[PDB]
Design a protein around this ligand. Structure first.
Ligand SMILES: Cc1cn([C@H]2C[C@H](N=[N+]=[N-])[C@@H](COP(=O)(O)OP(=O)(O)OP(=O)(O)OP(=O)(O)OC[C@H]3O[C@@H](n4cnc5c(N)ncnc54)[C@H](O)[C@@H]3O)O2)c(=O)[nH]c1=O
Ligand SMILES: [Mg+2]
Ligand SMILES: [Mg+2]
Lengths: 413, 553
DNA sequence: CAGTCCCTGTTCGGGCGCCA
DNA sequence: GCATGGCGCCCGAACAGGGACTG
């Protein structure tokens, strides 16, 4: 298919990616070998030498109900440096209606990009290297010749074709919302679940008419609750309790300026005993309830800012519960949720967090069509070792590792 | 002259070639070097160059394994600065423990391997060098490489890379043969008849020749005691090659490096190796030649290990039909040892892990780190993570991961009794202790003078303040908690506005690099019920206030 | 609010081991 | 004026980031 490849410009003065490849389990190395040799024959990729200074890691994942493996490259890097290209020049709009639909489903149209060829000069930056078990052999290097999957550019270059492919479907059904985030396609409607599923299936077919292999999963933006912070309800108050309480209120005070505590403070005055019970005074009862009301009413001052990076924090609770908050500046949460004991997930703190992260990343895509940067509550080498065994999305968020004990227990849970 | 297609190479924009002068050499060197260049000249490896070539790079020679002949090297350091980057393909090093048993086996090696791959034409100019006369009394001869030189950062990579392309055809048509290539060193193994093998080995050795790759008869032919990668592969075991430790009266820094280096190489198979005391000697910044008095504690190690290597061990091979097991033991404070085997005592590889990560940790944590390290290392060798047998009770671990705030995990693991055992040495209380003297601690210092105070004040009436020298608002905070811990009984209730201190303590650390924090731990082990609570720092809280006014005169 | 400290974790260089 | 690439281990300097304190 001889076509005129859009020229990919790079961030001025940006060095391409140079990331080492990481060890791969046998089963996923042999999967990658198979996957790549057919890709080589089908001409998608081309073998290369060590003269190409660049590199990006690869691995592979097997999803739900799909026995066939999927290749996945961490272009996380090549994306930060080509950002000018896909966010500004060939940007793709984000419908702020999708967050409102009754049901949304995600399709893997990533395959469709393999159709368009990639600009000759930019190919050298997609280089990757496949490892060999026990280093029986040096790394085999390959580079892409077509729009790859994982690069944020690909879904940006194919937008022109996508518009068209989807034009007739948007005409017959002007009440559904389609959003293209990388390898994903997000179709949202307010129809009843059984017919919604059929519109999805008439759309899948619609994509079949052009040659695009589209191999608990339905989403529901309207059923997502931004659960706030709450204060406990005790009959008798101990010195300890009134303490912890203040602890939280003073803290939650950076959120809303109205919470006062000076009235609950005079109670502790004088070195007392922790187990010492204290009569529930009226100066307090007033202000206690007084504050309890402020924490129900939504925080004023919230606003999204496309010009700023999104940030997610997760706290580990226990009994499988996790809590998170997405924000752009401290104490101005956009949303805060509570990932629960997933029915089916093993007692594997890491497998769980891995799942939470993908939920957040998803919710995050639907709400602002942008991925967040995570502050994971786990130790780097601990996460670095197993995160891939559990991953099941096609994109990867930029995460950083943080360790911070629980002050005032967990105000959020 | 090799038919193999060359790999295009460029220099970095704005940089010209190397113009560094040759430094004078020794009589014998200039002697052997010319015998070499003459032979290369004729073979077509190098070329005599005119004076129009403005470049040059110093050269020199070095003796080989048996010290018959020399190895012509070139100090292309300046050329490496200017030349384009490469991406390395050798990702790691093969390990005997990941080798399978095979009916027949052989191991070759390409002779003069670099000197049989064509260097990109345009680049050759920059590889020019000069060889002087006997006593530098007559102008020497200018030469340039037409083949991969030794000392250019691009060589190892281009070679290794060119080699796999040459073996790709042969390896596809012979999917039943396993070949381990590391540079020019080949290892071919098969479950073919002892004679059919020798036929493949011929069919193969003759495949390289077609690509210009020589194969000197100096190679492991049907020789059970195979020498591959600095190991001795036997038919059903593998070992490391004679490992001789440096034995001397007075030790210099460098000497100790060369000593620990080797003991690590030993840990790969000799179990029980420890080098913690030995390396401690390397603390501070010291010269290679700085002589350092071998310490007492290290004298124990240096000797202990020496006793271990006296009694040789061997490794076994791996087979995909049986799972792997990696058992680990806690060898010293911070140190750990581990062995991976597929059978009872049939060991396939042993190992040491001794990185004490962070200022404060505990055995559970350091253990978790080791499992991770092994898990990874084993995935590289075998591509599958093994089963574990760890010296920690199932209830201990379960007590930890539910209580710890960070997500943590350990793969399939069973119990194994062998002291010392891993365990948490104490456990703060979830709820405040009834009928117990409550301590309200705090402290502070004037970061401008280093002077500072620490104290407490209980509900019963107790009270104290201690003056401090060279301390900080953070250390102080800790120090305070120390006091409240000493001046308490077996049950205590402490409260602090110190997020920092509270941070450390809750993690249940059992070891640290901090004197103060070591003492606090020790004291925490002596109590029977501890309970720390946190309150806002400069709020008007009840007890905090008081101690506060006290500590900041 | 902005500028200092302190404490701590993560990255990278240099030296040795071992291989080529 | 004594080379290169790879992996490992061990120590320390440089650097980054969050909380507490200071003017
Ligand atoms: C050691 C070393 C290697 N290299 C790079 C460049 C070099 N290619 N070249 N030329 C390539 C392989 O080196 P190798 O040591 O194999 O030498 P080379 O390939 O140059 O040629 P050759 O193998 O003929 O080396 P020689 O020193 O002439 O021969 C020694 C070899 O004979 C074999 N050999 C001799 N006796 C025996 C025996 N009894 N049993 C088994 N093998 C034997 C053995 O493999 C040894 O390497 O790695 C490097 O950059 N620096 C180094 O210091
Ligand atoms: Mg050789
Ligand atoms: Mg204080």
């Amino acid at each position: 298919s001889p076509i005129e490849t859009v020229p990919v410009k790079l961030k001025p003065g940006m060095d391409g990616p140079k990331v080492k490849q990481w060890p791969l389990t046998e089963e996923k190395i042999k999967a990658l070998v198979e996957i790549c040799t057919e890709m080589e024959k089908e001409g998608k990729i081309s073998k290369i030498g060590p003269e190409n200074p660049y590199n990006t890691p690869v691995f592979a994942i097997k999803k739900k109900d799909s026995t066939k493996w999927r290749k996945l490259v961490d272009f996380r890097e090549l994306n930060k440096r080509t950002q000018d290209f896909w966010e500004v020049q060939l940007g793709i709009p984000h419908p702020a209606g999708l967050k409102k639909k009754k049901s949304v489903t995600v399709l893997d149209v990533g395959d469709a990009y393999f159709s368009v060829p990639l600009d000759e000069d930019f190919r050298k930056y997609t280089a990757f290297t496949i490892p060999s078990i026990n280093n029986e052999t040096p790394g085999i290097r390959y580079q892409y010749n077509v729009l790859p999957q994982g690069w944020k550019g690909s879904p940006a270059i194919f937008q022109s074709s996508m518009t068209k492919i989807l034009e007739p479907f948007k005409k017959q059904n002007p009440d559904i919302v389609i959003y293209q985030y990388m390898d994903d396609l997000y179709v949202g409607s307010d129809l009843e679940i059984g017919q919604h599923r059929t519109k999805i299936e008439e759309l899948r077919q619609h994509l079949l008419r052009w040659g695009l292999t589209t191999p608990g999963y339905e989403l529901h933006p309207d059923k997502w609750t931004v659960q706030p912070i709450v204060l406990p309800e005790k009959d008798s108050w101990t010195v300890n309790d009134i303490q912890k309480l203040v602890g939280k209120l003073n803290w939650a005070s950076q959120i809303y300026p109205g919470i006062k505590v000076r009235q609950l403070s005079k109670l502790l005055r004088g070195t007392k005993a922790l187990t010492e019970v204290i009569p529930l005074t009226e100066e307090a009862e007033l202000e206690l309830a007084e504050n309890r009301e402020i924490l129900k009413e939504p925080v004023h001052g919230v606003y999204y800012d496309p010009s700023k990076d999104l940030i997610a924090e997760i706290q580990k609770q226990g009994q499988g519960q996790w809590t998170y908050q997405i924000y752009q500046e401290p104490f101005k949460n956009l949303k805060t949720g509570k990932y629960a004991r997933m029915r089916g997930a093993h007692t594997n703190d890491v497998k769980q967090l891995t799942e939470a992260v993908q939920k957040i990343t998803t919710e995050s895509i639907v709400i602002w069509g942008k991925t967040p940067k995570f502050k994971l509550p786990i130790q780097k080498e601990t996460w670095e070792t197993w995160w891939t065994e559990y991953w099941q999305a096609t994109w990867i968020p930029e995460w950083e590792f943080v360790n911070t004990p629980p002050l005032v227990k967990l105000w959020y849970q | 002259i090799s038919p193999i297609e060359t790999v295009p190479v460029k220099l970095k924009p704005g940089m010209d070639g190397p113009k560094v002068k040759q430094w004078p050499l020794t009589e014998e060197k200039i002697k052997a070097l010319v015998e070499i260049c003459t032979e290369m000249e004729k073979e077509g490896k190098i070329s005599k160059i005119g004076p129009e070539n403005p470049y040059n790079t110093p050269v020199f020679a070095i003796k080989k394994k048996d010290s018959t002949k020399w190895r012509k090297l070139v100090d292309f350091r300046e050329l490496n600065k200017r030349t384009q980057d490469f991406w390395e393909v050798q990702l790691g090093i093969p390990h005997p423990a990941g080798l399978k048993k095979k009916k027949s086996v052989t191991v070759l090696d390409v002779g003069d391997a670099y000197f049989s791959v064509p260097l990109d034409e345009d680049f050759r100019k920059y590889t020019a060098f000069t060889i002087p006369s006997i006593n530098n009394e007559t102008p020497g001869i200018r030469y340039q490489y037409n083949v991969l030189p030794q000392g250019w950062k691009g060589s190892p990579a281009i070679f290794q890379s060119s080699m796999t392309k040459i073996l790709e055809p042969f390896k596809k048509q012979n999917p039943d043969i396993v070949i381990y290539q590391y540079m020019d060193d080949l290892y071919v193994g098969s479950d073919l008849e002892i004679g059919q093998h020798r036929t493949k080995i011929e069919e193969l050795r003759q495949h390289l020749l077609r690509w210009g790759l020589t194969t000197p008869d100096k190679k492991h032919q049907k020789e059970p005691p195979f020498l591959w990668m600095g190991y001795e592969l036997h038919p059903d075991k593998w070992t490391v090659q004679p490992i001789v430790l440096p034995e001397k009266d007075s030790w210099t820094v460098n000497d100790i490096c060369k000593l620990v280096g080797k003991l690590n190489w030993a840990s790969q198979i000799y179990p029980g190796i420890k080098v913690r005391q030995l390396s401690k000697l390397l603390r501070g910044t010291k010269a290679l030649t700085e002589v350092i008095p071998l310490t007492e504690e290290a004298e124990l190690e240096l000797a202990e290990n020496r006793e271990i290597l006296k009694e040789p061990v061997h490794g076994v091979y791996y087979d995909p039909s049986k799972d792997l097991i990696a058992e680990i033991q806690k060898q010293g404070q911070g140190q750990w040892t581990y062995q991976i085997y597929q059978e009872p005592f049939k060991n396939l590889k042993t190992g040491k892990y001794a990185r004490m990560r962070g200022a404060h940790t505990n055995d559970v944590k350091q253990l978790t780190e080791a499992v991770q390290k092994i898990t990874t290392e084993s995935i590289v060798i075998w591509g599958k993570t093994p089963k574990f047998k760890l010296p920690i009770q199932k209830e201990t671990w379960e007590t930890w991961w539910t209580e710890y705030w960070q997500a943590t995990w350990i793969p399939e693991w069973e119990f194994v009794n062998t002291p010392p055992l891993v365990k948490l040495w104490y456990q703060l209380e979830k709820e405040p202790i009834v009928g117990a003297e409550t301590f309200y601690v705090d402290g502070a210092a004037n970061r401008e003078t280093k002077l500072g105070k620490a104290g407490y004040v209980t509900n019963k009436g107790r009270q104290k303040v201690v003056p401090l020298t060279n301390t900080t608002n953070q250390k102080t905070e800790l120090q305070a908690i120390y006091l409240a811990l000493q001046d308490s009984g077996l049950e205590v209730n402490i409260v602090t506005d110190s997020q920092y201190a509270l941070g450390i303590i809750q993690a249940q650390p059992d070891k640290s690099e901090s004197e103060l924090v070591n003492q606090i731990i020790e004291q925490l082990i002596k109590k029977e019920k501890v309970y720390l609570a946190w309150v806002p720092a400069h709020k008007g809280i009840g007890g905090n206030e008081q101690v506060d006014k006290l500590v900041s005169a």
